[PDB]
Amino acid sequence: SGFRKMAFPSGKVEGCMVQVTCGTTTLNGLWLDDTVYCPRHVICTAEDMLNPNYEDLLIRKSNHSFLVQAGNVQLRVIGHSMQNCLLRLKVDTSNPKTPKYKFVRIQPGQTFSVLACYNGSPSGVYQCAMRPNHTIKGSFLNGSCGSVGFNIDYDCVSFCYMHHMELPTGVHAGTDLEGKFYGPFVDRQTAQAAGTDTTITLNVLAWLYAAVINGDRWFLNRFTTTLNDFNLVAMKYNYEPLTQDHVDILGPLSAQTGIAVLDMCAALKELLQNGMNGRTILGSTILEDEFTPFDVVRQCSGVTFQ
Ligand SMILES: *[C@@H](CC(C)=O)[C@H](C[C@@H]1CCNC1=O)NC(=O)[C@H](CC(C)C)NC(=O)[C@H](CNC(=O)C(C)(C)C)NC(=O)OCc1ccccc1
Numbered sequence: 001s002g003f004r005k006m007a008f009p010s011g012k013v014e015g016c017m018v019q020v021t022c023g024t025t026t027l028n029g030l031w032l033d034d035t036v037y038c039p040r041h042v043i044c045t046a047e048d049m050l051n052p053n054y055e056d057l058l059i060r061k062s063n064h065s066f067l068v069q070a071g072n073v074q075l076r077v078i079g080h081s082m083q084n085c086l087l088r089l090k091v092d093t094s095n096p097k098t099p100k101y102k103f104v105r106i107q108p109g110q111t112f113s114v115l116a117c118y119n120g121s122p123s124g125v126y127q128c129a130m131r132p133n134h135t136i137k138g139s140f141l142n143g144s145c146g147s148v149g150f151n152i153d154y155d156c157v158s159f160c161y162m163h164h165m166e167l168p169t170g171v172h173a174g175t176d177l178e179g180k181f182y183g184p185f186v187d188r189q190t191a192q193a194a195g196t197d198t199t200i201t202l203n204v205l206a207w208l209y210a211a212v213i214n215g216d217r218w219f220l221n222r223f224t225t226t227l228n229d230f231n232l233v234a235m236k237y238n239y240e241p242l243t244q245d246h247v248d249i250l251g252p253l254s255a256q257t258g259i260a261v262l263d264m265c266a267a268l269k270e271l272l273q274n275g276m277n278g279r280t281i282l283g284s285t286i287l288e289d290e291f292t293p294f295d296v297v298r299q300c301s302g303v304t305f306q
Pocket residue numbers: 025026027028041044049140141142143144145146164165166167168172186187188189190191192193
C-alpha cells in the first residue's frame with residue numbers, strides 16, 4: 001500500500017495566514033480570533049538586524065506603524081505587544097475562519113507540517129521533523145518568516161512552530177507560538193551555528209515496523225540484543241541511545257507485527273554494521289528517521305501484510 005512523507009491537509013491553516021509590513025519589511029502572520037502573531041523582527045531594518053534591541057525598537061512604534069493585510073482586506077491594528085520573540089497585534093476584526101486550535105511546544109524527534117508562505121499567501125506544504133539539535137530541514141526563502149508548522153488532531157489545529165531564520169548549513173530555526181525559540185538561537189544576525197546532530201533512533205525503528213507492516217521482512221534476523229549492547233553500536237554510528245521509554249512506545253507496532261523491539265534493534269544493529277546490500281527499505285536506500293511511531297500508525301494499515 002505505500003508509505004509517503006505525508007503532511008496534514010492545510011486548509012484550516014491557509015485561512016489564518018496574513019501579511020504584516022513595517023516600513024520596508026514584509027513577512028507572514030497568523031490571524032487567530034482578533035490577534036495576529038508574527039516574528040518580532042518585522043520591526044527591524046538594514047542594520048537593525050545585527051544587534052537589534054527590540055524593546056527599544058518597539059517603544060518607537062505605534063499601532064498604526066503596522067500594516068496588516070488579510071487577502072485584499074486591510075486589518076486595523078488596535079493594540080500591540082511583544083511576547084518573547086513574537087509580536088501580538090490586536091486587530092479590530094476577528095478572523096471568521098479561526099479553527100479550533102491550541103499552541104504546543106513540540107519535542108525533538110517529533111514531526112509537523114509546515115505551510116510555506118510568502119506575502120501572506122500559502123505557497124506549499126511538507127512534513128518536517130524537529131531535529132535533536134533543534135533545527136528543521138525545511139525549504140524557505142526570504143519572505144518566508146511567520147510561516148507556521150502544525151499538526152491536526154480531529155479538527156483541532158496544534159500550532160507548534162513559526163519560522164524566523166536560516167543557519168549557515170542551510171538548516172532552519174524558529175519558535176513556538178509563545179515566541180520562545182527551539183534551540184539556543186536568537187533572532188539577530190550574529191554568527192550562530194547549529195549544534196552537532198544525531199540520528200533519531202526511535203523513528204528509524206518505527207520506520208522498520210512500517211516496512212514490515214506493508215510487507216517486507218528482509219532485514220530481520222534471528223538474533224536479539226540487550227539495550228546496552230545496542231547502545232554501544234548506536235554511539236558508534238551517531239544514533240541516539242535507545243531507552244526503555246522508547247522501547248515501550250514501540251509496543252503497539254511490536255504487537256501488530258509480532259516482532260520484538262530488541263529483535264528489531266538486533267535487526268537495526270546488523271543494518272548499521274553490514275550496510276544495506278544495495279537493497280531498499282520502503283523504497284529507501286538509507287535508514288529514514290523522520291517518521292514517528294505515531295506517524296506510522298496513522299498512515300499504515302491497522303492490519304499487517306503477513
Ligand atoms: C524571513 C524574514 C522575512 C522578512 O520574511 C527570513 C527567512 C530566511 C531567509 C533565507 N532562508 C530563511 O529561512 N529570516 C531572516 O532572514 C532572518 C532575520 C533575523 C532573525 C532578524 N535572518 C537569517 O535567517 C539569516 C540569513 N543568513 C545571512 O543573512 C548570512 C548572509 C549572514 C549567512 N541568518 C542568520 O543571521 O543566522 C545567524 C548567523 C550565522 C552565521 C553567520 C552570520 C549570522
